[PDB]
Design a protein around this ligand. Structure first.
Ligand SMILES: NC(=O)c1ccc[n+]([C@@H]2O[C@H](COP(=O)([O-])OP(=O)(O)OC[C@H]3O[C@@H](n4cnc5c(N)ncnc54)[C@H](O)[C@@H]3O)[C@@H](O)[C@H]2O)c1
Lengths: 241, 241, 243, 238
């Protein structure tokens, strides 16, 4: 990773922060993208709203201009939602489609010509097991993750010839600041609530952000040089339910 | 099917037309929806543009009000786009998402409460093997079909408790006006191109609209009473390629 | 028209789904040859008792049907052994039994049936597999792998033999109301109907399948309405995910 | 990997050899299993026939007895068959089921208790994209690889609680001595031609697969259980 440049979206979140940290430790220079990013330790800061076409279309070019090149993209930004389709509003729809699917589409569409010209690169999409398999009460979340997984596999096959390796990491349960905050606000000790949630996973715990980041780094690395369009599940053995 | 009322979208196209014909022959009353449906023999005509929120939201209620009940919805309307994602325009994106994914969402969101209050019903979505598996140079088409397959499965499990049976038929190659049109534009004689395409199918022929319509009818019939959230592939043995 | 004048072989014909498939086919006008360990009580058009684990019996089944009824249009591979346990609790005997009946036997039957059907202009083969196997489930390793194997075989054969006019597809149930299931409940002092209803509550549809729920899909797959289906794995699960 | 012990089956073959090399380079001690393993640099040699129940049942215990512990099992032995089902002989069936499915079954069944008692481990099965998706004219091969992928996933769920991580790597096209045999068509021309049907633009070398095996055995994959990791260079099954 020494000398390489990476864009990471959703950089202010749990998995995002862990991916940024791991890439910079590995010697990559990293551009960070989220709604707001000024406090994140990174090599280029690109705050913005992914729902705005101009910002998402322009992200890969902004990284190449600011840091001189673009080797890796991690599409990690994502909206969590829930409900049966009958409980899904138009606003829920627009927000999730815009950030979970359209934004990755725009970023990849822009990044690919840059990487092709440079002789190759790696894109890693953070999708979910929810969407590879259907689950109850989360129709919108699943369909956007299924759209993203499909995109990854199609792009993976379309752009392999240009030396661009496009793959996905598909978590299930993940420990994050916001999961813990949710517990605290409802009166639960977050550490205990997290352990209990872990007992529903065959491995016995939910993922830490680093569990996910380590797989992202593998996919971006030369060890994964023959993976194209692969969807790598990282779920501790836990089935969607 | 006697006494039953069905809504069919994309009623003016190849598969839609075969579906309308088959339901009517079997004694159902059919409401037909498409941009224009004036030519079509049917029990209720509902012209409009699926991209319009209010029209899509309103379709199921228009059928229940017009014909007195709503037993079956066939989401058959669909747009074909082609290209690697680097060749996919913003106009392409809006069109495919709006018609292939957002329209079925709006129609199901509206139909489900109506059917639930009436003791159940059946929804059949026409998705595609392209989507279930990735194919070259059709990134947008695949991702919309994968989103629709995922929605089918999630809704199928969310709403089976209300007696609503939601499944999808997933064709691969079908001889339809749009498949032909696509060839002519490129610019091969459609009849020759269709014949050549038929030869790439292990079964030894391209599917006709009736091959698909017969499966849609199965899915809406009592024979399929235990199928919920199933994705029924109808590909003559041919892999996505 | 339809199944009139056609001949079918159904295995596991004394069991729940098998028995429902035999009845439905004969009502639709087909003559049916039944196979199971014992079949004497079964109303059918040819009786072929035997042990599917014996290579000679499984190899010879389609030919015995063609000789006995004059033709072979449809094969329903329905026989299956139920097993459970993590792989660490799976014995060599468990292994030999499940592989022999769930995988090796349909392999032998289809290998023998395909040439006969190819020579006669085509036919239909329907395998009863399981959603367990399509997705993994806890504590049933052997059951799952045999069902996965059968599902894979269905798809490869479906693709390989469609050019011969042979349509090979599978039905994949999840929860089904069988005599083994009901006997199991009866012995725990349960009311089997109530216990069956209770197990139904774990299915989004709200009930487990009756054997007729499954048989009507088997009939669809062997019928003209399914003429464009080759290598399809048709899930019939009432919405219930493997768990 | 320093101080860990791995068992690698099919160790005399292309992928097996590259896996053994990679593990020892990372500091693991490796026991090698195949029909003959005399030539292979390793810390324990366990030659034998996987079709023999006793041999397969005894492999994990032999490694624990010989090197003192068992941390990693790579089920890599495999038999290549071809044909439609109607061209598949009884001998083909026995050979493929025996080596591709029963052997890993026996090995995992024996390895699991040992690993569980030690606090955990990793098992990596080399399955295939063929089997996950169906492909023309290889019915026996596909079904055995499908069986093995299913076993991997079920075992992954069943034994994660004991700290055992069970996963599979699923190659498509790979340049291996065995591929080249069975071609002999001229081998290196055939390998190069096959190479050009892969969107990446080349077929995998054994090291391309071995590096994924190593990832899956490693600490970076500590949250993967029952995952089937495809390594196909973008190439769909066909
Ligand atoms: N031809 C095949 O090989 C292929 C393969 C798999 C699935 N599909 C799908 O099957 C279904 C039927 O389509 P078809 O194959 O008969 O092609 P078709 O064009 O002959 O018919 C599809 C219909 O969708 C309608 N539609 C498109 N945009 C619309 C809009 N903005 N508002 C309202 N209606 C609109 C069209 O006007 C049309 O009549 C679709 O969902 C399609 O994508 C067909």
């Amino acid at each position: 990773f020494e000398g390489k440049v990476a864009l990471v979206t959703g950089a202010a979140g749990g998995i995002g922060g862990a991916v940024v940290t791991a890439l910079r430790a590995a010697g990559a220079r990293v551009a960070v993208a989220d709604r707001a990013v000024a406090g994140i330790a990174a090599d280029l800061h690109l705050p913005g709203d992914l729902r705005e076409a101009a910002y998402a279309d322009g992200l890969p070019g902004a990284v190449a201009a600011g840091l001189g090149r673009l080797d890796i993209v991690v599409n990690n930004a994502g909206v969590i939602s829930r409900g049966r389709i009958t409980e899904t509003t138009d606003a829920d729809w627009s927000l999730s489609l815009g950030v979970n699917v359209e934004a990755p589409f725009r970023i990849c569409r822009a990044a690919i010509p840059l990487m092709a010209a440079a002789g190759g690169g790696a894109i890693v999409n953070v999708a979910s097991c929810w969407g590879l398999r259907p689950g109850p009460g989360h129709a919108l979340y699943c369909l956007t993750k299924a759209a993203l997984a499909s995109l990854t596999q199609c792009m993976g096959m379309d752009h392999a010839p240009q030396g661009i390796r496009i793959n996905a990491v598909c978590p299930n349960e993940v420990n994050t600041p916001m999961l813990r905050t949710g517990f605290a606000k409802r009166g639960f000790d977050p550490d205990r609530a997290v352990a209990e949630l872990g007992r529903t996973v065959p491995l016995g715990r939910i993922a830490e952000p680093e569990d996910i980041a380590d797989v992202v780094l593998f996919l971006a690395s030369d060890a994964a040089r023959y993976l194209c369009g692969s969807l790598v599940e990282v779920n501790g053995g836990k089935a969607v339910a």
